[PDB]
Amino acid sequence: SMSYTWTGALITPCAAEESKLPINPLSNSLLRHHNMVYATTSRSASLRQKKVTFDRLQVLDDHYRDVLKEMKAKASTVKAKLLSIEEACKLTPPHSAKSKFGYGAKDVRNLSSRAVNHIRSVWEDLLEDTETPIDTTIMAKSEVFCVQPEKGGRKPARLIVFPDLGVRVCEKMALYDVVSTLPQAVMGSSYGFQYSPKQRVEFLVNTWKSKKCPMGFSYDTRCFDSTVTESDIRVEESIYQCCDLAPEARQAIRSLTERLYIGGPLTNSKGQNCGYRRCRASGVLTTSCGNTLTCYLKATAACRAAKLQDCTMLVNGDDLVVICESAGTQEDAAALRAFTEAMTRYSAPPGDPPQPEYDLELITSCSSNVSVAHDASGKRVYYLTRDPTTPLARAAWETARHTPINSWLGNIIMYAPTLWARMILMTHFFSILLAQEQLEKALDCQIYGACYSIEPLDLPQIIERLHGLSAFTLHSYSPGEINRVASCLRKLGVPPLRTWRHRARSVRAKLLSQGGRAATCGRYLFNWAVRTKLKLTPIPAASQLDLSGWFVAGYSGGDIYHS
């Protein structure tokens, strides 16, 4: 069967769509090669549609059934609570897509009569109706990238598939507790979204150093979402059903599985029948948990199939990394090829074939690799970094255009110890915010899929929790990391690092002059910029922070808001 069938109706935008980075004094001071930065539009959806649409073969085996039973066994431990309409509405992003039936997200959040009645009747319908496919909208997602030269040229838009707001709320009631509890209970330390940045590094390094002779690799599946079959989604349901559930939750999940998750009709922004999905929806609550469970299931089974020895794996939706015991290079290569063949049979064929890796720093997972610097006292300190091209492009875009999500802020938070986040992102964005007296103004970003509202002035204490004091004192980055950043900047026409130091000195002064919370940013975020460096003791209010819901689960596509 096919991931998708199409009527021929176009995937239509519902606004004007911007695709060229503007010429702007502020974005130009970050990045000069503006013609290299673009945003995807629905104009390219057609191309994505081809890519995402294919037939699937899935042959299951005993390794699969064994691993499933073992997961269900752990799932059986869970007891999951039904969320109230109150809690579920408060999880709705303030700018979430309005319902087709009058109300929008503000009315959900205010618990207005229209929204709540509509939500109750959607809920009743999930209990009464077992079969009717629920409708979904299909939109071309606008994301910013840098042009890739002789690599492809330009990326076509990604596609998001989501149900109406009413349903989205009813999903949270039935499932928010499950998707944010079950994956941990099932996969234990292999569940990626449980780790803060510092914890992810520890886990990767400890696992690596714990192996007698480590070999590692990552595995990129070609369109994970389109390769998810309806068996997979039913199997995923079977895991959920092992939870103690309130009866209304149980029916809700059941109806939601047959009616929404397993597949259904697609409609374009103009109300026209677009086609039919028989694979994972990118834009539902279970998308992240479902993908993580499925990736883990298939991957664990395929390990058993390839007889990889003492495997530790770390899964974040479709992103998967394995670290195991080497058995020699020829034999490591053979086992890896067998592993792919097993994934391929489970319907998770690779994008590019996986490459056995013997140095932890040569492994990329979720765009990231471990790298090494030293702290003030000079000790080696591992930390996660990435190629800064995409972040920098997105930052330029966000500096030029008001956008709902500030990826620059997310990148500062998640990649705070990196050379490029400290020297460029912080300098740039604190210089602007300072100029515009927006330091206190809160700003939306996403971490692990969920949406957070963060005040920039709270960044020092956030970074301390997420990374530890170390993140403000790192120096002597690896040659390879420095040169990646250096050439990245030449490519994009970002001023050289030398220039950012100069701009930082100015910014730091201006923050210290301001005193209070602003001055703390100056001291901590920009200590690297000065020669006569300040001693940095732990920030008191760091320990007072409530990051309770920050690194608990993944919610990519799931319409989730924290504050």
Give the DSSP letter of residue 149: T
* Total chain residues near ligand XNZ (CB under 6 A): 19
Q: Is 410 in the site for ligand XNZ (CB under 6 A)?
A: yes
Nearer to ligand XNZ by Cβ, of 240 and 448: the residue is 448
Q: Tell me how far, at minimum, the Cβ of 478 lies from ligand XNZ, in Å.
A: 16
Among residues 84, 110, 367, 563, the one that binds ligand XNZ under rule CB under 6 A? 367
Handedness of CA 90, 95, 97, 101 (dihedral sign): positive
Q: Is 556 in the site for ligand XNZ (CB under 6 A)?
A: yes
Which one of 81-89, 218-226, 278-286, 410-418 is the stretch in contact with ligand XNZ (CB under 6 A)? 410-418
Q: Is 464 in the site for ligand XNZ (CB under 6 A)?
A: no
Nearer to ligand XNZ by Cβ, of 240 and 408: the residue is 408
Determine how many CB atoms are found less than 10 A away from the CB of residue 213: 11
Element (H, E) at 444: strand 443-447
Among residues 326, 411, 470, 520, the one that binds ligand XNZ under rule CB under 6 A? 411
Interatomic CA distance for residues 376 and 367, integer angstroms:
28
CA 54 to chain CA centroid, nearest Å: 25
Among residues 200, 254, 277, 298, the one that binds ligand XNZ under rule CB under 6 A? 200
Which one of 32-40, 90-98, 144-152, 447-455 is the stretch in contact with ligand XNZ (CB under 6 A)? 447-455
Nearer to ligand XNZ by Cβ, of 308 and 370: the residue is 370
Q: Collapse the DSSP code of 236 into the 3-class scheme (helix H, G, I; strand E, B; otherwise coil) and give the result.
A: helix
Interatomic CA distance for residues 72 and 329, integer angstroms:
35
Hey, what are 141's tokens? 């997602």
Q: Residue type for 185, please?
A: A
Element (H, E) at 219: strand 214-219
Nearest Cα neighbor of 1 from 242, 278, 210 is 278
Among residues 312, 326, 446, 461, the one that binds ligand XNZ under rule CB under 6 A? 446
Q: Is 366 in the site for ligand XNZ (CB under 6 A)?
A: yes
Q: Collapse the DSSP code of 351 into the 3-class scheme (helix H, G, I; strand E, B; otherwise coil) and give the result.
A: coil
Nearer to ligand XNZ by Cβ, of 175 and 414: the residue is 414
Handedness of CA 263, 267, 272, 274 (dihedral sign): negative
User: Residues 485, 487, 489, CA angle at the centre, nearest 5°?
Assistant: 70
Nearer to ligand XNZ by Cβ, of 71 and 414: the residue is 414
Task: Classify residue 532 as exposed, middle or buried by CB count within 10 Å of its CB (0-12, 13-18, 19+).
Answer: exposed
Residues at the annotated binding site for Mg(2+)? 220, 318-319
Interatomic CA distance for residues 448 and 404, integer angstroms:
16
Q: Collapse the DSSP code of 158 into the 3-class scheme (helix H, G, I; strand E, B; otherwise coil) and give the result.
A: strand
The sheet with strand 264-267 has its strands ordered as 4-6, 273-277, 264-267, 136-141, 158-162
In contact, 203 and 195? CB cutoff 8 Å:
yes
Nearer to ligand XNZ by Cβ, of 119 and 451: the residue is 451
Q: Collapse the DSSP code of 370 into the 3-class scheme (helix H, G, I; strand E, B; otherwise coil) and give the result.
A: strand
Q: Is 312 in the site for ligand XNZ (CB under 6 A)?
A: no
User: Residues 541, 547, 548, CA angle at the centre, nearest 5°?
Assistant: 130
Hey, what are 99's tokens? 């319902």
Q: Is 414 in the site for ligand XNZ (CB under 6 A)?
A: yes
Residues at the annotated binding site? 220, 318-319
Among residues 197, 214, 283, 522, the one that binds ligand XNZ under rule CB under 6 A? 197
Nearest Cα neighbor of 554 from 104, 22, 181, 53 is 181
Q: Is 447 in the site for ligand XNZ (CB under 6 A)?
A: yes
In the range 376-395, which residues lie near ligand XNZ by CB under 6 A? 384
Interatomic CA distance for residues 156 and 51, integer angstroms:
10
Q: Is 369 in the site for ligand XNZ (CB under 6 A)?
A: no
Q: Is 397 in the site for ligand XNZ (CB under 6 A)?
A: no
Cα–Cα separations (whole angstroms), residue 11 to 165, 275, 307: 20, 10, 44
Nearer to ligand XNZ by Cβ, of 31 and 471: the residue is 471
Q: Is 368 in the site for ligand XNZ (CB under 6 A)?
A: yes
Among residues 415, 452, 477, 524, the one that binds ligand XNZ under rule CB under 6 A? 415
Q: Tell me how far, at minimum, the Cβ of 204 lies from ligand XNZ, in Å.
A: 9
Nearer to ligand XNZ by Cβ, of 177 and 319: the residue is 319
Nearest Cα neighbor of 173 from 123, 220, 134 is 123
Which one of 128-136, 235-243, 405-413, 433-441 is the stretch in contact with ligand XNZ (CB under 6 A)? 405-413
Which one of 115-123, 217-225, 404-412, 432-440 is the stretch in contact with ligand XNZ (CB under 6 A)? 404-412
Nearer to ligand XNZ by Cβ, of 216 and 410: the residue is 410
In contact, 558 and 287? CB cutoff 8 Å:
yes
Q: Is 431 in the site for ligand XNZ (CB under 6 A)?
A: no
Nearer to ligand XNZ by Cβ, of 255 and 287: the residue is 287
Strand pairing category for 136-141 and 264-267: parallel
Which string of x and - marks every residue 322-361 that binds ligand XNZ (by CB under 6 A)? ----------------------------------------
Which one of 17-25, 103-111, 442-450, 471-479 is the stretch in contact with ligand XNZ (CB under 6 A)? 442-450
Nearer to ligand XNZ by Cβ, of 199 and 506: the residue is 199
Interface residues with ligand XNZ (CB under 6 A)?
197, 200, 316, 319, 366-368, 384, 407, 410-411, 414-415, 446-449, 554, 556
